[PDB]
Copies of this chain bind each other. A is one copy, B any other.
Amino acid sequence: QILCVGLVVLDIINVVDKYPEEDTDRRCLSQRWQRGGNASNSCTVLSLLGARCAFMGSLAPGHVADFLVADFRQRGVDVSQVTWQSQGDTPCSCCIVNNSNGSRTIILYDTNLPDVSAKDFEKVDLTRFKWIHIEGRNASEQVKMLQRIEEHNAKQPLPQKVRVSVEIEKPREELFQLFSYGEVVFVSKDVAKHLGFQSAVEALRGLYSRVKKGATLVCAWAEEGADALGPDGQLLHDTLGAGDTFNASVIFSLSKGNSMQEALRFGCQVAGKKCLQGFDGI
């Protein structure tokens, strides 16, 4: 299995012909209940590509988690490693999408559910996973999870070593400690542009010194494609969830045994196709 550690949310998406007028009752064009969140979206894509994947994130028992668990299960995503919370509610957002202009109005219900902790991760049987991907969030706890994986891999032969990847999507300084963990580091365009970069090449040839020895840094740009830099010094070269689609596609291609250049090409092909309503049809 491929394990994705991160967030899950329930998005209730209503497509309208006109933005709703206060105190009125109008019929929408369509409604879709869609599981969201970076790691959750990565599981949707991994599962579609035929991989056996698992989701690790926080859920609180209730009607929202009943839907999410059923959706993950229908998709074939293993949820046995979910961290069930006694305090809080599972986040759910109601999205209004206006077809006459393209606007997205979001009403977010979030009680700030506790994130997955190192102590929760200690319970994970690492021998069940070939790859573990961590969506950067509570970095101080996540570094302890990544250190646990390294300690596990130190006692293991090469074919039994759990491959690791990390995503740094938001410019929270807290997340930059994650750069030195994982064999594959995904850095977003937002993080790059925030750290004073205008090009994908610029970002890669400035951040590479922050990764661990032997690791590969990957950065997908908006329309410019996607670039990767490995230890050999050789540079290689509906939108909701496109970045997640790219991340999961690269992870998939690399876990199969393909080269970084093949994984980049594949990642761009699948993510581009997704930009289709949702993830079915990729």
Residues of chain B contacted by A66 (CB below 8 angstroms): 66-67, 70
Cβ of A277 < 8 Å from any Cβ of B? no
Residues of chain B contacted by A22 (CB below 8 angstroms): 19, 98, 103, 105
Cβ of A117 < 8 Å from any Cβ of B? no
Report Cα–Cα, A25/B26, bound state, in Å.
21
Residues of chain B contacted by A103 (CB below 8 angstroms): 22-23
* A22, A23, A25, A107 pick with most chain B CB within 10 angstroms: A107
Q: A70 to chain B: closest CB distance in Å? A: 7
Residues of chain B contacted by A48 (CB below 8 angstroms): none
Report Cα–Cα, A67/B65, bound state, in Å.
11
Chain A residues 1 to 42 lying within 8 A of chain B, measured CB to CB, are 12, 14, 16, 19-28, 30-31, 33
From B14, B63, B105, B109, A20 is in contact (CB under 8 Å) with B105
Cβ of A94 < 8 Å from any Cβ of B? yes
Cβ of A174 < 8 Å from any Cβ of B? no
Copies of this chain per assembly: 2
Among residues of B, the one whose C-beta sits closest to the C-beta of A13 is B94
Q: A114 to chain B: closest CB distance in Å? A: 17
| Size of A's binding interface in residues, CB under 8 A | 34
Report Cα–Cα, A21/B103, bound state, in Å.
11
Interface of A is mostly: strand
Chain A residues 72 to 117 lying within 8 A of chain B, measured CB to CB, are 89, 92, 94, 96, 98, 103-110
Known: A22-B19, A22-B98, A94-B94. A107 touches B14 (CB 8 A): yes
Among residues of B, the one whose C-beta sits closest to the C-beta of A68 is B63
Known: A63-B33, A94-B12, A94-B14. A108 touches B26 (CB 8 A): yes
Q: List 23 A-B contacts (CB under 8 A).
A: A12-B12, A14-B107, A19-B22, A20-B96, A21-B105, A22-B105, A23-B103, A23-B104, A23-B105, A24-B105, A24-B106, A25-B105, A26-B106, A26-B107, A27-B108, A27-B110, A28-B109, A30-B109, A31-B92, A31-B109, A33-B63, A67-B67, A94-B96
